[PDB]
Amino acid sequence: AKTRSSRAGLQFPVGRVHRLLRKGNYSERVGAGAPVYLAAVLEYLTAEILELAGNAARDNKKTRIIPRHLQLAIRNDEELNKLLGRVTIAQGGVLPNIQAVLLPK
Amino acid sequence: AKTRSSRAGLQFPVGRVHRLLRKGNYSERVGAGAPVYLAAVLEYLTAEILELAGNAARDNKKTRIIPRHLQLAIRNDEELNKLLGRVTIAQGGVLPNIQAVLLPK
Amino acid sequence: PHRYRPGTVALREIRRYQKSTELLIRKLPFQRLVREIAQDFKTDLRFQSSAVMALQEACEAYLVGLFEDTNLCAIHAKRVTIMPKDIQLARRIRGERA
Amino acid sequence: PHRYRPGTVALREIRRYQKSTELLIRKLPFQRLVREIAQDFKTDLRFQSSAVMALQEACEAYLVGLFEDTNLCAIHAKRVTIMPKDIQLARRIRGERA
Amino acid sequence: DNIQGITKPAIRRLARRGGVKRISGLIYEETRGVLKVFLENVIRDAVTYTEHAKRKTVTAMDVVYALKRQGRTLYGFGG
Amino acid sequence: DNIQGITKPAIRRLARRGGVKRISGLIYEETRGVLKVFLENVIRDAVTYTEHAKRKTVTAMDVVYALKRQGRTLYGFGG
Amino acid sequence: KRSRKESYSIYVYKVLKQVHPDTGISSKAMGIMNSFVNDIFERIAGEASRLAHYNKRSTITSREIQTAVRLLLPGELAKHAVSEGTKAVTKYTSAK
Amino acid sequence: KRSRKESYSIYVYKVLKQVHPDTGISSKAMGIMNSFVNDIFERIAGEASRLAHYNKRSTITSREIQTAVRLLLPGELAKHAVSEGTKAVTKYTSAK
DNA sequence: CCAAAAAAAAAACAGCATCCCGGTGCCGAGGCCGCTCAATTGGTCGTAGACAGCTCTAGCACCGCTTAAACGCACGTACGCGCTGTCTACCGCGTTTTAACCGCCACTAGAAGCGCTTACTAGTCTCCAGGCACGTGTGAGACCGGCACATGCAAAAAAAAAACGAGCT
DNA sequence: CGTTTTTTTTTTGCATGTGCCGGTCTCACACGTGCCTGGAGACTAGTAAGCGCTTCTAGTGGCGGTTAAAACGCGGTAGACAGCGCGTACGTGCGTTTAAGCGGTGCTAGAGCTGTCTACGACCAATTGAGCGGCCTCGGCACCGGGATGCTGTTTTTTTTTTGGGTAC
Ligand SMILES: [Ca+2]
Ligand SMILES: [Ca+2]
Ligand SMILES: [Ca+2]
Ligand SMILES: [Ca+2]
Ligand SMILES: [Ca+2]
Ligand SMILES: [Ca+2]
Ligand SMILES: [K+]
Ligand SMILES: [K+]
Secondary structure (H helix, E strand, C coil): CCCHHHHHCCCCCHHHHHHHHHHCCCCCEECCHHHHHHHHHHHHHHHHHHHHHHHHHHHHCCCEECHHHHHHHHHHCHHHHHHCCCEEECCCCCCCCCCHHHCCC | CCCHHHHHCCCCCHHHHHHHHHHCCCCCEECCCHHHHHHHHHHHHHHHHHHHHHHHHCCCCCCEECHHHHHHHHHHCHHHHHHCCCEEECCCCCCCCCCHHHCCC | CCCCCCCHHHHHHHHHHHHCCCCCCCHHHHHHHHHHHHHHHCCCCEECHHHHHHHHHHHHHHHHHHHHHHHHHHHHCCCCEECHHHHHHHHHHHCCCC | CCCCCCCHHHHHHHHHHHHCCCCCCCHHHHHHHHHHHHCCCCCCCEECHHHHHHHHHHHHHHHHHHHHHHHHHHHHCCCCEECHHHHHHHHHHHCCCC | CHHHHCCHHHHHHHHHHCCCCEECCCHHHHHHHHHHHHHHHHHHHHHHHHHHHCCCEECHHHHHHHHHHCCCEEECCCC | CCHHHCCHHHHHHHHHHCCCCEECCCHHHHHHHHHHHHHHHHHHHHHHHHHHCCCCEECHHHHHHHHHHCCCEEECCCC | CCCCCCCCHHHHHHHHHHHCCCCEECHHHHHHHHHHHHHHHHHHHHHHHHHHHHCCCCEECHHHHHHHHHHHCCHHHHHHHHHHHHHHHHHHHHCC | CCCCCCCCHHHHHHHHHHHCCCCEECHHHHHHHHHHHHHHHHHHHHHHHHHHHHCCCCEECHHHHHHHHHHHCCHHHHHHHHHHHHHHHHHHHHHC
8 A cells, every 4th residue: 555645746645635625625526647746736736835945944044944934935936925925924024125215314 | 286485485596596406505504594594695685686677777768678778777775885895797887977177167 | 259268078089988887998999909819929829709709808907907906096196197207107106017 | 321213223223033933912912812712702711722823823824914905005104103084095996895 | 998988077076076276288198097007006905806706707895805805994885 | 982992103104004194183082983983893793693693691603703703703712 | 398497576575665665676686685595694604514523413404504694694784684584583483 | 752743844854855855844834834835735735626516526636726727826926836846747657 | 618526436445244164063854663454355236427319409601781899190298207305214233121931849620532323314205386498478677869057168257366666663 | 350453253246066856768687498417316345434442742840049121210401392494296177179989880809509439648567766754973163252344423623604793675
């Protein structure tokens, strides 16, 4: 016995995802592709954040990602910012931004 | 002489709602009171708008409520306008409302 | 030789259209814009008549509400004339743009 | 004795707090206010410390965002001072307020 | 360029419903830009709903479903 | 004066993160009112959740469910 | 053909005649009223659904529909609605 | 012992090490990454859930997860996300 | 032009904050372990939906009138905006007062878990009328005269509120 | 106190829109009809969840010292804001141009419906290893002090703008 996730080339639990789709009252029946596809997408998006979030942390001179790194990552990427435009990241603060008219001459 | 609507004292089909609830992938099982309680709330809110829409109709010497009457009813009421703050009513126009500063002296 | 002062007819137009509920874009030039915009995504696309009506009801509703907000912005600047920056501030606060 | 021109510290303070992520409201007062406001909905209520922190992370985020949108309204009126009418316009256009 | 079919006189009428009394000359080109994006962002989703149902005709329901996702729910086309 | 426990200098800090450089004295009280109407609207819903779960303790998840409802989804406290 | 497309429009007419028995309703208005009931059906049903799921229960009861209405309807509307719905449940559990 | 609180955190760590092998993650930063997976899970699932009900179909297939992703994810994110899913399924269908 | 007075420009100069480095110490990320329950496997059975074929709805194209609406130009008023100038609100920093914060201990509310038990809802097969489509009627309302009527502007009616004797203390 | 001007304000004078009657003609709301499918019913069976009972988590309250944060007051600059003044960008209103809107016909893509048939996913029981809770450790990172650096503000000096004479029509 080897996991669906091993077969599909993913790090994300295809098994777990399948269960959550049945138990989540989304549809009567769940196809076999569905959880594999959904797992892949969650993994892809998870990769994209941790990619930029890592770079954020490296630029701080820090080993471990912290919420701010995730925030700097998300708010500076145009599309990730739009995807999470109605989402508050605890302990993330805000991007450094001072309106030009407020700086001295 | 019986029907689940008339036992609860309603004009909204308690049966229809109980089936919509089962078939609409919300929960495994639907309690007998749920579709009663719901039909009641949908009726009560429909009455509330019709009441005020027919008070905007009778205020135009109109026998028949049109979209504009519904809009007028919903926007001039603070609570209804909130509940439907993100809805557009088609052929509904906008409340007569001019900013004081744009008027003449 | 009669001449209404600048902004007198405007207040009439405000009053006139705020009273009514008719679409204020000419339907054919709009429909054409729909099909043009549509083409980009998928070619040889048909539209229900109602579908193009739903899209114009929406587009107009949206634009009237933006002018509402855009107006408040102009008033806030102690002006009476809506300008691009008025729109841009309405949309930046609305969340529609960065 | 040395003295900074009005707003040079303000600019400094901006830079300081835009760099950091710490909650800026004192925890105990905020928690009291959370309990006060709760008693309006139900008496003898208990709160998970996370539930209080969740609410403070939320309010603080909301307010910072509101001050950003406020500050834009002020600049739009060719000012540099935020005033209650910058906050009122901001919330009106957001659709928090009638 | 059927966007130009959205005429100054038509934009002014929308503005007027929107209680506007006076109007910069730059607004008409601005307003067209905003309109195009609005229709792009709605239609793109409408046509996605068309494609999934495997149709060649955009239905009113397609637009209704799209408008609801853009947070612009529309009553009286099949809501 | 629990609401005053939200000190002038706290609000002033919040605005600096907001990148505000100058602050009318009327803002501090205005700000107190906005904040009160914010917690009221969340804690209301928050507690409605606590009630329905038949609990006397408000849980972070209650808050989280409440913020998601108010269109203010929060990350890093569950959900 | 023409499907057999179910509506609310009879149960709307059966409420319009009760509040304002003199005055009627155009189609476009009845369409906006059909949209309305469907919207709010989904809002309430949807929240009840989550309410259930959060609390690890398998059944949507009148209690889930109640809390859902408390969360979704503003001040006065939420009270009156609770009542009419508590009223209708009691009169139904009377009537066998 | 304490009851079982499930989490995506072992898979987040896996992906992180693929992308940045020498990089760690705070407990909070992990909680954010969890909120994130569950958020988008619900968003895609629900949009799929709807797509199915709209087209009178009992089954959420991979095709529903795809259309859901083209609706939800902005531009390039949707394309890349759609590919990754389409790869993942193909590869899963070949091994059986 | 002439010449003088500011208003900006550059310069040097003390000063205070911020940033970077190495050193220290604590704790939480990280990883290991052992048990557990959720995912996997392999089996059977039912039905959702894929597909082929047929119906006919309504989306498209085209045409030819009649305006209603777009367009373009002339002209001038009222607005946007730049400039200046005045008053103090708001910023900075100091000294004084407060209470948050921290760490800790003590007590127990109530969150949460488990076991039992049964009332409640899902599932099924039979029945049938409420609610559907389809189709015809008829009166509301939109349309189109003209007729008060209200406005709202071009002023002249006069009528108040200042600028200047007034002429005396 | 009056007595010239101005500065405000009152009442006509037409010219433009809505607001309003009477007819009055069409199409869409309204209701009736007949037929189909979705709600009703009584049944069985299983289990979801209410309840009672037990566990021990973590939420609450109190205390006393430290010091960072709030407070409150003094002072002065820089911003809000009111007024003025200038140039033209918009609004109004024609006369000219356009093409949308209307009603109609003719053609067929494709929306949508039906019946058939099977590949697919639900459900089941057995099997077991992935992933969880708990537990341990050790380096990343928070904290601190010390020195280097950068940026601010003041006072002095330089540079140019800017402004109040001294002749001409
Ligand atoms: Ca009947
Ligand atoms: Ca009739
Ligand atoms: Ca007429
Ligand atoms: Ca009449
Ligand atoms: Ca077909
Ligand atoms: Ca293992
Ligand atoms: K507890
Ligand atoms: K380590």
